[PDB]
Design brief:
heterodimer; A: alpha+beta; 4-stranded antiparallel beta sheet; two-stranded antiparallel ribbon; 2 helices; 6 strands; 16% helix; globular; B: mainly beta; 29% strand; cell adhesion
Chain lengths: 86, 7
Amino acid sequence: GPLGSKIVRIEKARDIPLGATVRNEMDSVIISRIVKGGAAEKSGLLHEGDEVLEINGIEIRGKDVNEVFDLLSDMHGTLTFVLIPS
Amino acid sequence: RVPDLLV
């Protein structure tokens, strides 16, 4: 995919985080840690250093991490991530 | 300094 990206799907429950922290690096959103015991880890599809380009068609690149927190806090169901691997 | 938010 664009910029050498990849598509991964992960299920999210209402009001339960996936288990991944994010930080801004320049204009990008980067996965800084995979929380042990969370859905993100068990999925084995999200990894530290991954850049998040899109989630459910929403462009994540260019967003402050606080806006990304807001978006995911109320998302649920099948989440479609567009990622650039580390 | 860089903020790390949990999602």
